[PDB]
Amino acid sequence: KLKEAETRAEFAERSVTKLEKSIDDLEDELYAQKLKYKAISEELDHALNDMTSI
């Protein structure tokens, strides 16, 4: 039960590790997507302020 619980604990440590990685990947991907997406598309709307001038 211990080896199994340890497997579960280790599983959870690994699953957590995989998710520590995937949370950071999502933290970095959400970050990067926002950082590039609102920063670029919002910038593109700033550019609209100028693009659509004239």
Partner: protein, 375 residues
């Protein structure tokens, strides 16, 4: 407590037989696909002693028995031994007689048709079952897992079938079947444990290796890096207790065996492994049916219970897959038993009560009826 003619469900592989009645969420008992027979000359008399032992009986008295498994790569060849297993299964543990209940049996979609015809014939002519239904194992995992859509990768004991299903429909042209299974993994491990100084050849020895594999082995996510440290340090070794009190300590063999599923060349097969067969099934499906199979990588059967497998399979498909697509794996605790559970679900559906072959239909048509009524 069976006061209703519920269908019986029995999933029979090269490895284990899972059986129980429809309506439950688990098999009531597991009969490990076996009929055992003594290989020695008797000296004492009045010792009882059977000509053959079945299921758990074969394992309990295995010290002097040769153990024969009736199913090869998911195909029943020793039908007489399956009758012994089914009689024991249904009457001694489930406490039912098939004569009073519909019975559902299972098999891979490309399993030679003779197998589905014999399963139908045996239950109707030997057990007098009032009705029959041979089910697809891939389907049953999808019911158990809550899916109608996905690639079902049945990495069990016999054969890995790999069949894409979309919205409840088969996409059979995209089936990528492999002669890669749990019984090849055991043989590989017997050979690499021999390399370490622990030879395994005979039946008792084969059973030990199978048990070692199930309890000590894993796949992890990166074979070469896992091997680099497993081959360098005792920190990745694990000990196993052999039946006679001896101890075997296993290092990179702990993962080299499971790795065969990703590297079939380990057992002499010209194949790229289960993650590419899973991926190709997605690829071989229509352009508007791939965006759903990528998001639904579905596990079925055993070996799916190796540590690191849920993430390695999602990772390997993701690596093979194009970007933008979302890749996801379904790997529920109903693992190693999802097919049985699906059998219970299917047998019990109101929409399935017309799918059963009745005994009268069988007697009029014969064994070939299974291809007209089941699949």
């Amino acid at each position: 407590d069976e006061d209703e003619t519920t269908a019986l469900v029995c999933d029979n592989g090269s490895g284990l037989v899972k059986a129980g009645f429809a309506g439950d969420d688990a098999p009531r008992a597991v009969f490990p696909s076996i009929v055992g027979r003594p290989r020695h000359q008797g000296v004492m008399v009045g010792m009882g002693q059977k000509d053959s032992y079945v299921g758990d009986e074969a394992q309990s008295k295995r010290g002097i028995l040769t153990l024969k498994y009736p199913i090869e790569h998911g195909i029943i060849t020793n039908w007489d031994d399956m009758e012994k297993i089914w009689h024991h299964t249904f009457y001694n543990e489930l406490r039912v007689a098939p004569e009073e209940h519909p019975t559902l049996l299972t098999e891979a979609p490309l399993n030679p048709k003779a197998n589905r015809e014999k399963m139908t014939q045996i239950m109707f002519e030997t057990f007098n079952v009032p009705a029959m239904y041979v089910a697809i194992q891939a389907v049953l995992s999808l019911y158990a897992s809550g899916r109608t859509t996905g690639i079902v990768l049945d990495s069990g004991d016999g054969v890995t079938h790999n069949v894409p299903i979309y919205e409840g429909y088969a996409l059979p042209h995209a089936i990528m079947r492999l002669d890669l299974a749990g019984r090849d993994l055991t043989d590989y491990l017997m050979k690499i444990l021999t390399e370490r100084g622990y030879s395994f050849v005979t039946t008792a020895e084969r059973e030990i290796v199978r048990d070692i594999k199930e309890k000590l082995c894993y796949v992890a996510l990166d074979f070469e890096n896992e091997m680099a440290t497993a081959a360098s340090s005792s920190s990745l070794e694990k000990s196993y207790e052999l039946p006679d009190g001896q101890v075997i300590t296993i290092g990179n063999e702990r993962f080299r065996c499971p790795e065969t599923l990703f590297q079939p060349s380990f057992i002499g097969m010209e194949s790229a492994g289960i993650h590419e067969t899973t991926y190709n099934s997605i690829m071989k499906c229509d352009i508007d049916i791939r965006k759903d199979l990528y998001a639904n990588n579905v596990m079925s059967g055993g070996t799916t219970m190796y540590p690191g497998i849920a993430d390695r399979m999602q990772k390997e498909i993701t690596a093979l897959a194009p970007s933008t697509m979302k890749i996801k794996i379904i790997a529920p605790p109903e693992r190693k038993y999802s097919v049985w559970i699906g059998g219970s679900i299917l047998a019990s559906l109101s929409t399935f009560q017309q799918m059963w072959i009745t005994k009268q239909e069988y007697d009029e048509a014969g064994p070939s009826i299974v291809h007209r009524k089941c699949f």
